[PDB]
């Protein structure tokens, strides 16, 4: 990426926001994190290091043994996930007055990650912070084939989207380790079983499985990892081959639309394609790494629901000086609402936070329900919607035995495909409509 090649102490000055390139080698331990933390301790600056995932937060904590850190005495350096910071910023609970924010894998398009960049960007622009955003693919990335530590062999290829019973020998004949990016867990399951039946040992990584399964990759007893986009956020595989479907499935809100729908499988962004490719080409002493890719990229990501959701979160983060935060500069043109448009009044905000935290509902839906004045425990909104919001399962209208006693058709006032797009999501939403959590 085009970021700074190396940390310099100047980056700790107030009002500085610096992109630092990430070009990890074959080595286990990252080195740059402990250097930055040492420099923050030397400067006596109150610092948070922000990991994209719990796995990366644990790797940082291990790398930082010997430095005074608080992993979430008198420690002035905290280590936590992007989403932990954003969650704490939404609650009345005090968050430390950090001088320095270091965001690892700062390209992450999770709404909590985008909102945290906005909070950080705002504190920097106030002259109350310095920030380092570590990423090989900062906003406005267009090149899917950036320069790498080692040469990569790039090859367009037909990539299976289903189990195969002939052809694709190039996939199974390879003797090394392959990381294969798929647009869905379900398609990944089909491919995985095909490879297992062909005598391969397969690990399946996705947002749900990552905490348990990613640790299996550190051992060399596997042939394939079948992964979703979550492995774009700091996964370190001991592999020399990537297969990239070049596809994703994403939630979208059409401009001025009233609902969230899923799109795809469809082309990924250049940033995502570069991150997937960037799992390999890491060791300057090892030529011959291979990237096989199955389709084009698109820079048109403005429909992704995570942009509106990040703005919803940031409009609801109360700053102690009464300033409305803005998104990080290069992400501001992803949304078209005026600053503060989504800010909830006090009781609505309490219910919003519970919809996110205990309800496990998406940001958009949590907002719509909270803004409408429903109490967290008041599930009447799940039934009072229009006919086209009826939810169907194995092709029949879903009936809920409500807590009050009556059986009602599941027909929410607001329709978010993420709560009914598969069996597991619909089960959780039915449990919610029934008042089980």
Describe this protein's structure.
With 437 residues, the chain is of the alpha/beta class. Among the domains are: 17-133, P-loop containing nucleotide triphosphate hydrolases (Rossmann fold), CATH 3.40.50.300; 153-293, P-loop containing nucleotide triphosphate hydrolases (Rossmann fold, 3-Layer(aba) Sandwich). Helices cover 27% and strands 17% of the residues. The protein has helices spanning 32-42, 54-63, 82-90, 111-125, 169-173, 185-197, 210-213, 270-277, 305-315, 346-357, 363-371, 423-433, and strands at 17-20, 47-51, 69-71, 77-81, 100-104, 130-134, 152-156, 178-181, 202-205, 224-227, 241-244, 247-252, 261-267, 289-293, 392-393, 396-397, 399-401, 407-409. The strands form five sheets. Strands 1-6-5-2-4-3 form a six-stranded parallel β-sheet, with helices on both faces. It has a six-stranded parallel β-sheet with strand order 7-14-11-8-10-9, with helices on both faces. The protein has a two-stranded antiparallel ribbon with strand order 12-13. The longest helix has 15 residues, at 111-125. The chain is globular and about 65 Å long.
Provide a quick synopsis of the model:
The chain has helices spanning 32-42, 54-63, 82-90, 111-125, 169-173, 185-197, 210-213, 270-277, 305-315, 346-357, 363-371, 423-433; strands at 17-20, 47-51, 69-71, 77-81, 100-104, 130-134, 152-156, 178-181, 202-205, 224-227, 241-244, 247-252, 261-267, 289-293, 392-393, 396-397, 399-401, 407-409. It is of the alpha/beta class and 437 residues long. Among the domains are: 17-133, 3-Layer(aba) Sandwich (Rossmann fold); 153-293, P-loop containing nucleotide triphosphate hydrolases (Rossmann fold, 3-Layer(aba) Sandwich).
